[PDB]
Design a protein around this nucleic acid. Structure first.
Ligand SMILES: [K+]
Ligand SMILES: [K+]
Ligand SMILES: [K+]
Ligand SMILES: [K+]
Ligand SMILES: [K+]
Ligand SMILES: [K+]
Ligand SMILES: [K+]
Ligand SMILES: [K+]
Ligand SMILES: [K+]
Ligand SMILES: [K+]
Ligand SMILES: [K+]
Ligand SMILES: [K+]
Ligand SMILES: [K+]
Ligand SMILES: [K+]
Ligand SMILES: [K+]
Ligand SMILES: [K+]
Ligand SMILES: [K+]
Ligand SMILES: [K+]
Ligand SMILES: [Mg+2]
Ligand SMILES: [Mg+2]
Ligand SMILES: [Mg+2]
Ligand SMILES: [Mg+2]
Ligand SMILES: [Mg+2]
Ligand SMILES: [Mg+2]
Ligand SMILES: [Mg+2]
Ligand SMILES: [Mg+2]
Ligand SMILES: [Mg+2]
Ligand SMILES: [Mg+2]
Ligand SMILES: [Mg+2]
Ligand SMILES: [Mg+2]
Ligand SMILES: [Mg+2]
Ligand SMILES: [Mg+2]
Ligand SMILES: [Mg+2]
Ligand SMILES: [Mg+2]
Ligand SMILES: [Mg+2]
Ligand SMILES: [Mg+2]
Ligand SMILES: [Mg+2]
Ligand SMILES: [Mg+2]
Ligand SMILES: [Mg+2]
Ligand SMILES: [Mg+2]
Ligand SMILES: [Mg+2]
Ligand SMILES: [Mg+2]
Ligand SMILES: [Mg+2]
Ligand SMILES: [Mg+2]
Ligand SMILES: [Mg+2]
Ligand SMILES: [Mg+2]
Ligand SMILES: [Mg+2]
Ligand SMILES: [Mg+2]
Ligand SMILES: [Mg+2]
Ligand SMILES: [Mg+2]
Ligand SMILES: [Mg+2]
Ligand SMILES: [Mg+2]
Ligand SMILES: [Mg+2]
Ligand SMILES: [Mg+2]
Ligand SMILES: [Mg+2]
Ligand SMILES: [Mg+2]
Ligand SMILES: [Mg+2]
Ligand SMILES: [Mg+2]
Lengths: 102, 51, 97
RNA sequence: GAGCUGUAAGCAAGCUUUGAUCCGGAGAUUUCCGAAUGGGGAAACCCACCACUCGUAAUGGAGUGGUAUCCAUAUCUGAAUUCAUAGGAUAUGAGAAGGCAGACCCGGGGAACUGAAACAUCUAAGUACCCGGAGGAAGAGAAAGCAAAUGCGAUUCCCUGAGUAGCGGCGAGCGAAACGGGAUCAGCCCAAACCAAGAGGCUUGCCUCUUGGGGUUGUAGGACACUCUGUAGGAGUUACAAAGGAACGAGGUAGAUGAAGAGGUCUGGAAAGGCCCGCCAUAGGAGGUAACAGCCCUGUAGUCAAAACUUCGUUCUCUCCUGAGUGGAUCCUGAGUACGGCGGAACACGUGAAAUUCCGUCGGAAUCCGGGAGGACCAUCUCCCAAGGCUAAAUACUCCCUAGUGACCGAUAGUGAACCAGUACCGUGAGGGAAAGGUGAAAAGCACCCCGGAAGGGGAGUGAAAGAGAUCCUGAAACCGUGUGCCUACAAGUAGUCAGAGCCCGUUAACGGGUGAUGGCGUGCCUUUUGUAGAAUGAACCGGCGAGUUACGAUCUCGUGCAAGGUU
RNA sequence: GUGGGUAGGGGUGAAAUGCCAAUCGAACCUGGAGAUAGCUGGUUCUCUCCGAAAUAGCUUUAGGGCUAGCCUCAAGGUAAG
RNA sequence: AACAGUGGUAGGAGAGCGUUCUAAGGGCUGUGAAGCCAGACCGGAAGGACUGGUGGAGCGCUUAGAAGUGAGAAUGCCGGUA
RNA sequence: CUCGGUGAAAUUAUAGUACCUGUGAAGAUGCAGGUUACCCGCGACAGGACGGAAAGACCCCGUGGAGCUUUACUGCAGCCU
C-alpha cells in the first residue's frame, strides 16, 4: 500500500476528514489502516475471562487506505507518493516537494 | 490526409474528438461529430475518391 | 399436393430433352449499335468492354430489331438475314468472325 | 518490501528488514489404490520369493531394491530325433499396455423412428450408435489428371457454376463436376536395367540373397556407350539424408516506473454529487474508495525489467552433396497386377445406354512395334504413363491458458450448479438429479437493566437507518388476524347493475367519497359446438415462468439508389 | 441358508404369456429424440375499417386436403353491375 | 362544411398503447432514483400523470433502432397459501 | 360421541347454495311462474349436486401402435442341392 504502519497521514475523507494521525496498524488484504484517534467505535463487550468486567469500550476501527494520504515533510500538506532508488534501496518520496517520506 | 501520429496521439484522450485518415471517413463518424476539421490535403484526397 | 387426387404435373407427360451442345448467343439488336459512332469496328470485345453485352456466351448474334443509321464495321459470330442487310444497307460491313 | 502463521472468528504459541508471509522459474519429497505389472483381491486390502540392511542366541519381526505379460535384440541350452528346430533359461530395452477434449480427423461395422400423406424400391443416412487408429491437425497430393484453346499444369479449402446437368416406385426426394474468381503454394524419394563388394546354393562362370553405388520418366526417361563436367559453391533436419553446438535479436512464464485537486463552498452519515474555480492527458481503460472520481487508492498511456526455464527468428558452426549434352545395339521402366465374368459396395448417378472407383470369388493381359483415359462400344485424334512411397501451407476443431468484447442473462433467468453441486436425495445398477444469492460504509453483531427455565420480548446503547438485529436491501398478492364508520336475525341471492332514502365522511373539488333499507333488470369465465347457464371441457387461490421464431432460399407489396441496364 | 449360472429379437417356465428388482404379449437406463401425431388441449395489449363458410368437384377420401365458390387488401378498367 | 355510415365469429386490412435493451440529444435524482402502497386526476382504448407514505440508488423524456415485447385458462411448470 | 394434547387428506370458477310445475343442449340450488322459508351450530342419513377418483376398458374413428396366425406380400436365417 502507499502508506504503512508508523506513517503520519491526514484523513482526506469521511467524518474524520482533516484529522491527522499515525497508522497504528495496516491491513493489506482488506486495503484498510488503523489510524490513531480516527473512526472511534463503541464496542459492547460481554464479560469474558480475558476481559472480566466487560463494558462499552471506545476503540479505533479501520478506515479504507484510499481515504488517507501521507504528509509532505516540507509543507506539511498531503502528497501523492512516488518512488526513487537511493543507495540501492527503494524509498517513497513526496511528489509535492521531492523529499523522502520514510 | 495520411496517418498523422502526433495528431492521433494528441487528440486520443480528449472526449468527443476522433481522428481519421481521408480513407477512414464514414457516415456515422461525420454525423455524430458536430464540427468536421479537414486539412486541405485531405479534402483533395476525399475529392479524388468521391468525385 | 391435391389431397390424393393425381397431381397436375403427374397427369401430364414429360416433353423433350436438353441438348448437351446448346449454343446461346448474346443477342444485340440494331438499336444498340446506334450507340457507337461511325467508323467504329464493333467487335465482341468492344461490346463486352463498353457493357452493351454483359456476358458473351457462345458469341454475339446481331439481330434486326430497331433502326441503324451508322456506317459500322460490325464483327460478330452470327447475323440474322435482316441484320446483315441493315448493316450493309447503311454503308457498313457485316463480318462473320 | 512489512507484515505474516489460508477459509475463520477466537485465544494460544510463534515468525519477520540478518528480508518473513506473498509472486514466478527450476529442483526435492510425493503413503496406498488405479494400466497396476511379484502373487492374490470384494479398488484403496491381503500374502510372497530373491538380494542386501536393521534386530534376535535363534525362530518370529522390520527397512530398501528387484521379481507381470507381450514384443525386440543378444547369448546359453536344445525334445520326440541324427543334424536340427519347437521349447526352456538368462541379459539388455525411457519398446508396448492405460487415460482423455462429450471437439475436430481417418478407417471397420451400422440402425430405426421418420418422409414417401399407407408401404416394400427409395428416404431418414452412411446419420445415431459401437469398434479400431491417430494427429496437432488429419485426410488429399505432384497427372495412366482436366479438357477440346495460337490450352491448362500436384493437392486442399472458399466463392461461383447451380438447385443447373443429371439421378429418381422419373414418386417423395437426392443432386454433381470442370471451366472462371480467390486463399496458399513445393516438390521429392524409390522398384527395375546396370555396376561394385561380400555371402551361400555351386543350378557349377550359372543362380538366388544382402549391403553400397546407379536411376527416376512421356511430342518418353533411364541403364548402356560416348565426349563433358563437379567432387565443395549449393542444400539441410517441415518432405527432399540426419544429429549437435554457440552467438545475437524479439516474445512468454514474476515484476518496475508512471502526470494532475483532500481547490473552495453547499447539502449530507459519508461527496466521487451541486455551485464556483484550477490542473493533467502518448494516461478520459477499468476496479475500488461511506452517493456518480482523468487529478484519493489500485491502476491506465508511455517507457523499462529476468537469475531460471521456455517459444520463435537470424547468423555462424555443423552436416550432406556433380549435373548437362549426343546416340539408338540390346536391356529396364511396379503381375496373379491391369482387365474380364459372377456377386456386392462407392461414385449426385437406384443396372441403367452406365463410363469411373473399391471389395469377395473365379478367370487372367500387353510390357515401348507397349499401356491407360476422354461417361456403353469401335475407329481416329488428343491428353497421359497405373499396379511403390513421402510431402509443409491455405482447411477443421477447442478440455484448456492469456487478454479482451457483447443493442447476451441477472438468481423460476444465465450452466444442472453465482452458495462446499454432479452435492443432497432417489435407484440393486446403468442412471436420474434438486433446492439454496443480498445486515451494514464499517461489526460499530445490541455493555447494562427488566419479564421469562429458555425461546422471545420491552427499555438502554451502536448506527444515517434496528419496522437494517442474522434464509437480517426492497418486501406485491393469495392467505391469516386486531380495531370499527355504514349495513345485517320474514329472508329465495351468477352476487352485479341501474333506481334509491337513511346514516357516516370530506376529495387530485368534482352535477364528491363510504355504506346500502328497498325497487327494476340480470343463468360466471374459457374451450368446443348446429346449439352450452349448462347436468360437456378446463382452472382451489395468488405470484412468477409459459406458444408463428431465426437462418438461408422464393415470391408479392411498399421504400430507396441507379436505369437498358442493375449488382458484385 | 450360503456361494454360484442363464439377460431382453434374450432368459427361465410341472405352461398362467407366468416370472426376470412393487415394471412384462416382450425389463430397465441412456441415446437416435424436440420420433411422428390429418388427433385433443393451449396460443398473452387496444381501438377502428370490412366481413365469411359449413357448398361443388376430385381424393385409401369422408372430423384431412386440394382447386373452385363466398371474405379481405392493393392496383387497374372505368360505369360494365 | 354538407351528406352518408359505424352489431359481428373465422378471417383480411389499418391505426395505436405498453415492456427490456441500444444510439443520439436533452434531463431528473441523497433537497431522495427504481420498486412498492394509497387516492375522489387525465386520455376514445391499450394506458398516462399528480400528491402523500414506504424505499434508499438509480431512472425518465424525445427521436430512431432491435426484440426472450404483453397471459386467465394448456388435468400447463415451480413456489407460496387456502 | 364429550373434554385436554396433537393434527392430515381427496376435492374446490366465485357462491347470500329451498320446494313444485314448467322451460332450456330435450333430466335445473342458480332460468320462468308459483309455493314455502327468522339467524348460527351439533349428532345422524345418503336422494341430488348427471357427487369424487381414473382425458371410457365397450363402441367407432386414426390411411395410430403392438402381440399372434397363415396356402396375404416381400424378404432373411437354417437346411438341402
Ligand atoms: K423405413
Ligand atoms: K404419412
Ligand atoms: K478514497
Ligand atoms: K456403373
Ligand atoms: K472381379
Ligand atoms: K491425360
Ligand atoms: K436449476
Ligand atoms: K373489517
Ligand atoms: K338489486
Ligand atoms: K363428462
Ligand atoms: K426387449
Ligand atoms: K417366455
Ligand atoms: K429396477
Ligand atoms: K383475392
Ligand atoms: K416513491
Ligand atoms: K394454470
Ligand atoms: K348441455
Ligand atoms: K347424498
Ligand atoms: Mg497517480
Ligand atoms: Mg409413410
Ligand atoms: Mg503431424
Ligand atoms: Mg502428438
Ligand atoms: Mg498426412
Ligand atoms: Mg527428414
Ligand atoms: Mg505506481
Ligand atoms: Mg475539498
Ligand atoms: Mg447509498
Ligand atoms: Mg510406374
Ligand atoms: Mg466419348
Ligand atoms: Mg429476486
Ligand atoms: Mg439456476
Ligand atoms: Mg444408495
Ligand atoms: Mg422499513
Ligand atoms: Mg444498500
Ligand atoms: Mg427485508
Ligand atoms: Mg329484518
Ligand atoms: Mg311472512
Ligand atoms: Mg353435439
Ligand atoms: Mg351445477
Ligand atoms: Mg373433450
Ligand atoms: Mg376441474
Ligand atoms: Mg396461475
Ligand atoms: Mg414384478
Ligand atoms: Mg431423427
Ligand atoms: Mg382456396
Ligand atoms: Mg362493422
Ligand atoms: Mg348499427
Ligand atoms: Mg393482419
Ligand atoms: Mg429497469
Ligand atoms: Mg411519487
Ligand atoms: Mg414472452
Ligand atoms: Mg379433541
Ligand atoms: Mg339458452
Ligand atoms: Mg322442452
Ligand atoms: Mg326440469
Ligand atoms: Mg324461480
Ligand atoms: Mg362422476
Ligand atoms: Mg377419451
Amino acid at each position: 500500500m502507499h502508506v504503512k504502519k508508523g506513517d503520519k497521514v491526514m484523513v482526506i475523507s469521511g467524518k474524520d476528514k482533516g484529522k491527522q494521525g499515525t497508522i497504528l496498524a495496516a491491513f493489506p488484504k482488506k486495503d484498510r489502516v488503523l489510524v490513531e484517534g480516527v473512526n472511534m467505535v463503541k464496542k459492547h463487550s460481554k464479560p469474558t475471562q480475558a476481559n472480566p468486567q466487560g463494558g462499552i469500550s471506545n476503540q479505533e476501527a479501520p478506515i479504507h487506505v484510499s481515504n488517507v494520504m501521507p504528509l509532505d515533510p516540507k509543507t506539511g500538506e498531503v502528497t501523492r507518493v512516488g518512488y526513487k532508488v537511493e543507495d540501492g534501496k527503494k524509498v517513497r518520496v513526496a511528489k509535492k516537494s521531492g523529499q523522502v517520506l520514510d | 490526409a495520411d496517418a498523422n501520429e502526433a495528431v492521433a496521439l494528441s487528440a486520443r484522450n480528449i472526449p468527443g474528438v476522433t481522428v481519421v485518415e481521408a480513407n477512414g471517413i464514414n457516415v456515422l463518424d461525420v454525423v455524430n461529430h458536430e464540427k468536421l476539421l479537414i486539412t486541405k490535403a485531405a479534402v483533395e484526397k476525399v475529392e479524388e475518391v468521391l468525385a | 399436393f391435391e389431397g390424393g387426387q393425381m397431381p397436375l404435373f403427374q397427369r401430364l407427360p414429360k416433353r423433350g430433352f436438353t441438348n448437351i451442345n446448346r449454343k446461346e448467343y448474346a443477342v444485340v439488336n440494331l438499336d444498340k449499335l446506334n450507340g457507337f459512332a461511325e467508323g467504329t469496328e464493333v467487335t465482341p470485345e468492344l461490346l463486352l468492354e463498353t457493357g452493351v453485352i454483359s456476358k458473351l456466351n457462345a458469341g454475339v448474334k446481331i439481330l434486326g430489331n430497331g433502326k441503324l443509321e451508322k456506317k459500322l464495321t460490325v464483327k460478330a459470330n452470327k447475323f440474322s438475314a435482316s441484320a446483315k442487310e441493315a448493316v450493309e444497307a447503311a454503308g457498313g460491313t457485316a463480318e462473320v468472325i
